[PDB]
């Protein structure tokens, strides 16, 4: 006779986790399980230790958080280190992305980012009279403000300008029916829009998704002077110390633990894990889009709501990172005017090749490596660059990089570019090579973006809890207002609990 | 009791009629259906005429064949041919591409395609000392000569340049387990890769797939002086003909019959069609990849083959026409140095602009439309230029321009860019508009293509009859030597039914 | 001092060049200069004098004097009577000969030498 629970969730990313603490609190005497179908908590979450720096995590997943704009994973952190021990509290470091001296490999002429303002004559982009002798983030603000007046007026929060997004119309059409790159194709140059993809490291951010949802998004982060903190012991503790608090609680985890599909009968969901049938009285799936796309074929109730999960489109994203004995790519300075030299160790250089975006990984304290055994990631990038590197393929974390290692004609091709990215014949060989892929399944993508024509203001409340009278619940980055962000997760998990908390 | 048929074929396109016909021939006592999903036969072939231009087709899907190299295209052109009366015959006129004084609208730069080899210092990519001054066919074969040396010379067919790509190597790997765009980055420049894509006109034909494929496919069309032919009453002809052959001869064609999925029970195929069961004692899958997978769930045997179906990835293509009272693009042409004026009239314009590639639709004799009611393939584009046109949205043929009707603001938008490509700020308004996104179900792709790490040669030769002592076969474009082509389709159709009369009893 | 390597094919031949009428001028024959310390490479001929236009191919990878030869020496660890074996040229040599003849055609990537042989004339007792 089949195993009895109250509560199921599903998914052992953040907003899972989250959930199964939160409820557990909240129901100390109801038996809940989270079941994950991977070997370990985290999800998009996954923080490694480098061989031979013992000070340096690698974030092969999300890596850094927004402190001025993310309330929720500010104050997740609190409540966690008001229950760790002093060895143990969470510590966060400043994050660095754009240094004056960093390397612009852009249509085969090397730049530094100071270029793009001091020598427009440098930058191969025929930008327009307007656009000229701009940054990226400066030329995109601009065109966001012509597209939506008053909206850049930095007096207003995410959240006022994500409503004056709702009630905005452009040439008389609601903004939630227009595409981001349609609109942004009105007021800038084929060229900036190349420009801003290229120098901006990402072809994911300026797609044709909702452009409602697009413009609050992108003025938060990519536009407006954006400030970062990382994780000084991996941003992956943070799942793994809400597993560890929901189970000290009395909670239960079972890792390799599927979800096959699930029915709806006699007032109970029977799950399908591992051949096994177990009943529970409610379902959470803490899950994106492409994870519930999986379910679907073996769960009829997620068949009758395909509209809602269909709302949204899976974006992969691709990361490795390369270890080195020395931090060779110091030597890619300059000798400034004075004749002081001017060191390249901090922040992204960025290419139009298909690295896209290098980064000079900074220790646990956020200072530069200066000397001895020294980490990049070497690419982190999206959209059609991902096809390039896939072709090559043949306390305590709880994941290893050997979990994730690099194939070596992947490194190769990885160390040819890197080479022609910084203008040299010689770097030091890799000595430890890691990549994650997250267009793979379950994931579909490492974030999940707004479709044209939805209102994510209505699916956002509907989809927590999508069935009436179904105790189904939904929750995760995926179909939040900070998707590709920890802070979309808990956005949602947040929603999702106060409806469960009225509802059961 | 259920209906009990001999043949099952599924899938309405050329490769589904050409092998109806060509059964039905071969078994003229045996019952064979062919299903098709949706409301006509043609699948991947659209061939409608303009509102206002009789004497035009718009193809919305395959438009032209390479006379010289797709001997299996033109024999069928004349099968079908020697069945037609002398008024229904199918011609073909010559089909234009590249003329000299075609527009390039690359990085903000107006060019002429003869400025790629006659002014390299205006065109706005760092090409390196051997690149410059090169159009991307030169830059491609000479990228391709140097990853597999002699395979450019013009004595070999295009069957032996894929024979010498299955023994080549390249570092000591096989060239199957390679990928076409990261052996091209071994050789050309980012700039002339980006270059190759812009002035090309497409995204989808040098993405990462198998290296040992795209050498030769790239060799035989986009490579080596391509020379094309178009359809007077349209491409959609064959696969009407065929079927009309296979209906004259006794066969059966019912559409809007969607198989919804397919058993194997008792030595017979149970095929689900319309909440009906009907049993086929062969089952014939002539549809591409994502035909396949939408059948997977409620298809058993499909299940058991998934190495075989996943061995290729579709790759969307997406066209637009656009019509106007007269061909205004005419008047975007130059005077040459003895003030003679030379028109913009015929073949393909190009633009890193989402539009990607512009055709002056030609006359069905092959002529320029040189005055009244005129059409524009105002955009061809794939790979992430699919995605700005999609979120724009809110004898006889057998399908109307109207069906396929273009909304509003995405031909505003096409207006604008063509105005922006052709350098100026006035055009007659568009009267009509017609488009198809053939990424769309259940399609996938406009075309598909060979994965890395996969032996074409073993799996096209494996998946027309992939279960041993199973009459369960497949054939289409998607498995072929020829993606991207119908005279793919005839490959696979012909590999198929040799399969198929060796191994099968001719009994009802 | 004089250097010889072979390769499979005459990468070479890809670094010509298309004349003002599209016609293709492949490199073949005679000698590449540099100032490089290569200094001259030669496209070996065929016995009868003709360009070798496919298949096993050699190179005169450098024929270099003066203060080049240091540079080459520092890299060291009918019927004729000599075999091209006992002239066998070292890996750490051939390496940055592959080096400088890719600078020197402007390609990234060349066909593996096959073969190698060298000879120093400056050695005693010459
Ligand atoms: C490359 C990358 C960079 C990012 N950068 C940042 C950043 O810098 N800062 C930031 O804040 N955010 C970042 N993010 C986003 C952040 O990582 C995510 O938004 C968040 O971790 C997702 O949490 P979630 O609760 O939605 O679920 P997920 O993390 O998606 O977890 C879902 C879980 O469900 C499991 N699952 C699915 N189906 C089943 C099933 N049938 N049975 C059992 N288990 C199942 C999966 O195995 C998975 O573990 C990044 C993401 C990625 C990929
Ligand atoms: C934009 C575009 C441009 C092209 N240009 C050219 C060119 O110039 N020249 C050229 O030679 N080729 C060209 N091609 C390719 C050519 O059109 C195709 O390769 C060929 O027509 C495909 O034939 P097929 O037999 O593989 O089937 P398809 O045309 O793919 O037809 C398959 C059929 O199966 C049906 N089907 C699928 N699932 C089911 C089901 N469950 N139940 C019932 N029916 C089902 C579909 O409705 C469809 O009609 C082009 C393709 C496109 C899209």
Redesign the pocket.
């Known amino acids: 006779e089949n195993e009895k629970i109250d509560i199921a969730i599903?998914?052992?990313?953040?907003?899972?986790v989250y959930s199964a603490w939160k409820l557990k609190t909240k129901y100390p005497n109801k038996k809940i399980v989270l079941?994950?179908?991977?070997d370990h908590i985290?999800?998009?979450?996954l923080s490694v230790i480098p061989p031979g720096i013992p000070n340096m995590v690698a974030?092969?997943?999300?890596?850094?958080?927004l402190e001025n704009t993310?309330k929720l994973?500010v104050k997740l952190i609190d409540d966690i280190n008001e229950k760790l021990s002093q060895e143990d509290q969470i510590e966060l470091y400043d994050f660095p992305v754009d240094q004056p001296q960093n390397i612009a490999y852009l249509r085969g002429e090397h730049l530094r980012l100071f270029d793009f303002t001091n020598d427009p004559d440098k930058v191969p982009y025929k930008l327009s009279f307007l656009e000229k002798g701009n940054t990226s983030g400066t030329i995109i603000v601009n065109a966001i403000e012509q597209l939506v007046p008053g909206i850049t007026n930095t007096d207003l929060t995410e959240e006022e300008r994500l409503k004056m997004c709702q009630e905005a119309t452009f040439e008389g059409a609601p903004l939630y029916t227009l595409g981001f790159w349609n609109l942004l194709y009105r007021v800038i140059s084929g060229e900036a829009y190349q420009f801003s993809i290229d120098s901006g490291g990402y072809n994911s951010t300026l797609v044709n998704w909702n452009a409602a949802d697009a413009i609050p998004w992108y003025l938060s982060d990519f536009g407006i002077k954006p400030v970062y903190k990382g994780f000084k012991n991996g941003?992956q503790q943070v799942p793994i110390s809400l597993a560890n608090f929901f189970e000290e609680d009395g909670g239960e985890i079972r890792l390799n633990?599927?979800?096959?599909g699930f029915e709806f009968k006699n007032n109970l969901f029977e799950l399908t894990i591992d051949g096994e049938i177990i009943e529970a009285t409610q379902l959470i799936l803490?899950?994106?889009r492409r994870?519930l796309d999986?379910?679907t074929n073996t769960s009829p109730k997620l068949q009758e709501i395909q509209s809602l999960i269909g709302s949204v489109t899976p974006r992969p994203?691709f990361?490795v990172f390369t270890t080195y004995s020395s931090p060779w790519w110091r030597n890619a300075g300059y000798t400034d005017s004075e004749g002081g030299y001017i060191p390249l160790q901090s922040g992204r250089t960025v290419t139009d090749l298909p690295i896209r975006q290098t980064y000079y990984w900074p220790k646990n304290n956020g200072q530069p490596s200066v000397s001895g055994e020294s980490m990049l990631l070497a690419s982190?990038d999206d959209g059609s660059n991902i096809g390039f590197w896939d072709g090559l393929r043949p306390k305590a974390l709880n994941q290893t990089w050997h979990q994730y290692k690099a194939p070596r004609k992947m490194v190769e091709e990885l160390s040819r570019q890197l080479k022609q990215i910084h203008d040299v014949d010689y770097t030091p060989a890799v000595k430890n090579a890691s990549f994650?892929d997250?267009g793979e399944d379950?994931?579909g993508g490492?974030?999940n973006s707004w479709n044209i024509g939805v209102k994510s203001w209505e699916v956002k409340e509907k989809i927590v809890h999508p069935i009436d009278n179904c105790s189904l619940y939904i929750?995760?980055?995926?179909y939040s207002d900070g998707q590709?962000?920890?802070?979309?997760?808990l956005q949602t998990?947040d929603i999702m609990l106060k409806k469960f908390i009225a509802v059961e």
């Open positions: 599903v998914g052992g990313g953040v907003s899972g079941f994950e179908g991977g985290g999800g998009r979450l974030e092969l997943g999300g890596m850094r958080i993310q994973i941003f633990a599927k979800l096959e803490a899950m994106p994870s999986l379910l994203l990361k982190y994650r997250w379950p994931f490492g974030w929750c995760g980055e995926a590709g962000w920890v802070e979309g997760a998990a």
